Amino acid sequence: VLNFVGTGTLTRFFLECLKIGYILSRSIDRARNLAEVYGGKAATLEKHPEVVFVIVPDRYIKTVANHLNLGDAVLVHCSGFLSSEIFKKSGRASIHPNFSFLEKALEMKDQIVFGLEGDERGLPIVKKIAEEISGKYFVIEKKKAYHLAAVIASNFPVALAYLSKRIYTLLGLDEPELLIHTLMKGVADNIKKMRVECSLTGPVKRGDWQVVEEERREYEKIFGNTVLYDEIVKLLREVAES
Amino acid sequence: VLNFVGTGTLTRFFLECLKIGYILSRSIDRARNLAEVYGGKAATLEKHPEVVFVIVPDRYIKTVANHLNLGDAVLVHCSGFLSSEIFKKSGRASIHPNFSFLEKALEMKDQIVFGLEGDERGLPIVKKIAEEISGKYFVIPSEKKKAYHLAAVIASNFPVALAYLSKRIYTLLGLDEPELLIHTLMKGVADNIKKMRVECSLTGPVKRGDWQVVEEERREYEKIFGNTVLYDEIVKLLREVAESERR
Ligand SMILES: NC(=O)C1=CN([C@@H]2O[C@H](COP(=O)(O)OP(=O)(O)OC[C@H]3O[C@@H](n4cnc5c(N)ncnc54)[C@H](OP(=O)(O)O)[C@@H]3O)[C@@H](O)[C@H]2O)C=CC1
Ligand SMILES: NC(=O)C1=CN([C@@H]2O[C@H](COP(=O)(O)OP(=O)(O)OC[C@H]3O[C@@H](n4cnc5c(N)ncnc54)[C@H](OP(=O)(O)O)[C@@H]3O)[C@@H](O)[C@H]2O)C=CC1
Structure with missing residues (x-):
């Protein structure tokens, strides 16, 4: 039940592919707007979810997460510089799409490689997600x-x-x-x-x-x-x- | 009224998309082959041409062009670095295709922005050609x-x-x-x-x-x-x- 917490191309990429729980943004206007193209809900002052994608700027990723802190889900993010170990909790993963996001040009996903790393429950999740979009990936310190x-x-x-x-x-x-x-x-x-x-x-x-x-x-x-x-x-x- | 020098991959280009009189090469066969496929003659101990595309390595354009000696003919090279002015003559020009020459990839012909730069009367000759091959180009001073x-x-x-x-x-x-x-x-x-x-x-x-x-x-x-x-x-x-962008 894929949950995305960022409103802006990339979650749009994933949505369009893996087409879902909630879609959060600091303003439902945008949240709604998206969940009305792929299907979901809204609000950074939302319900209780439980996999969650925190697709927001690096310096935020950590904070934004340790602020929703609800319902047993699997924490993940797309930053290739930070690990999942930032969340510092159960099932943590990291799926980095080596590509730059024109959301139309990224529709040629099968060419994109992913940098994957995680833990017990996490790793296999992003491996499947990764596998569901392109052929393969790479594992990463x-x-x-x-x-x-x-x-x-x-x-x-x-x-x-x-x-x-x-x-x-x-x-x-x-x-x-x-x-x-x-x-x-x-x-x-x-x-x-x-x-x-x-x-x-x-x-x-x-x-x-x-x-x-x-x-x-x-x-x-x-x-x-x-x-x-x-x-x-x-x-x-x-x-x-x- | 195009005569070319240097059987380079690049001349096969302008030839093909411009269907000519005299194609010079160090080899008589090599020149004779492009003449066979397009229409011309040969030798660098040639006849007496009179426009001349000197499509050869940036390293010999000047010298070679000074070993051509012929009358009434605007001169043009395709050097991306060198200028038409390297010819020091009254009717000169320079046409430069921003592209790398597979021969047929040049079916991309429509999307080749040209860097032209020529004489007063030598400019419209290359200006005219780019307009044909692909209507995208821009003139730049020789300096x-x-x-x-x-x-x-x-x-x-x-x-x-x-x-x-x-x-x-x-x-x-x-x-x-x-x-x-x-x-x-x-x-x-x-x-x-x-x-x-x-x-x-x-x-x-x-x-x-x-x-x-x-x-x-x-x-x-x-x-x-x-x-x-x-x-x-x-x-x-x-x-x-x-x-x-902040602006
Ligand atoms: N661009 C790139 O080169 C690539 C980046 N990534 C990874 O993707 C993630 C984000 O990438 P990027 O595309 O730059 O994103 P953007 O900066 O476009 O992301 C905007 C989204 O981030 C949210 N946001 C902005 N400011 C804040 C804040 N202060 N607090 C909480 N949320 C905020 C937005 O909120 P709202 O919806 O409310 O407007 C919106 O949902 C990173 O982890 C990055 O490492 C992965 C591959 C490539
Ligand atoms: N290659 C490219 O992608 C592009 C090239 N240009 C321009 O085109 C011009 C030619 O470029 P380039 O592709 O390297 O050419 P090539 O090396 O393919 O040219 C081969 C031709 O040059 C002749 N030649 C080579 N050496 C000599 C020499 N020492 N004396 C006399 N003739 C010689 C050859 O001899 P012969 O006739 O005897 O067979 C042949 O006709 C340059 O001015 C360059 O800047 C511009 C844009 C792109």
Whole structure:
């Protein structure tokens, strides 16, 4: 009897899949709104439930839980940085969906891998839930590193797309999104088809150090320094030299 | 009135979608083959052409173009870095397709934004061509092509350094095929950026303001790679991508 305590895409993802007890949000308006598309109820000043998904910001997850504290259920959350051991109680689990949530694009779930960890009653639950949406998952103490990897893989890339957007913007291209995507999408796919070490191309890849150097000045001129740039090049060589 | 130099995968492109007079190559056969499939002649000890697409490695465009010597013909290369101006002649231009050339994947032809930059009278020649192949493009001054290329690098190459960092830590955790996992994580962001503004695609902990993780994840990062240089930089920017929205 899946209970979700967050009103905002992700529970929407799970709802749409595992289509249910209650759906809570700090304002029934949104709670209702959702439980009227998949079916359930409402209120963060709700009834007594008993599995519960606390899909709210990390820094809250713990608190929000130790505040509803009712009816024998199985505590779970989607944070890949924190364990279930935060709840500090019976049947605790953690199901992390390595993906970024456009709720439409996440409808290609069968590709999503899950980071699972729990206890007696908990683990098997998220394993089944995990199994019910995609093919498999992974079990994690290494929570930190495992999650860091998801951030420097689905978060950090925006910092590049952003950087590229700024300079294109300044260059007159009014709507660069379409261009930036084409390139970034390519790299993504190419990162697959070719494992990382064989996926590289560009200036550094082939020498052309006069291009890397001249673009360092061009990087500095557009922004205020060359730190990130020098960092990515030092990285790229590490890649390139494989 | 198109003559091409360099039987590269990229010329087979403009040829195919533009059905020509003289296709030069170092090999007479190689030129003769594309002429057989499209229509032209050959040799770099050629006849005397007169527009000339010099589609060869960025490394020889100038030299080669100075070993072509022919009369009345606007010159154009497709270098993403180099400028038309490298030709130092009255009728020049530069057409750059942001795409990587499988030959037929180029059936994606409709969605190739072009980076043009040409002469006064050399510009409308390339401007006309992009309009055909795919009506998406934009002119850029010759004194800004280095900026332009820089951009492509950030969106093209740079991500790789991110794929590298993660694969490294997924393997530290003994993950089967990390690239898959990586591709999933990254493509979700790669595509989303098409249906929305770059800055509307950031979803992580910085976004939520979960500094508590941003901070520990940085010590975890230091622990794994020796420093926090790259980590600090992106985080600074992401916290910047997230505030822009606060408006
Ligand atoms: N974005 C990502 O990159 C991914 C995040 N996750 C995990 O998902 C969880 C949340 O992710 P995310 O999508 O950012 O969520 P959002 O920040 O969009 O979540 C909004 C939801 O959190 C609730 N909320 C906001 N502030 C508070 C508060 N002060 N107290 C209680 N509830 C609050 C909202 O309340 P209300 O409905 O009342 O408005 C709403 O239900 C985390 O555990 C995260 O680690 C998993 C995969 C990916
Ligand atoms: N590859 C891509 O995805 C893209 C390339 N471009 C631009 O297109 C141009 C060519 O790019 P690229 O794909 O590397 O090309 P290729 O290496 O595929 O080009 C091969 C062609 O270049 C000729 N060539 C190679 N070396 C020499 C030389 N030393 N002297 C004379 N001719 C030579 C070949 O000789 P021969 O004729 O004898 O067979 C052949 O015709 C560049 O200006 C590049 O910046 C732009 C966008 C994308």
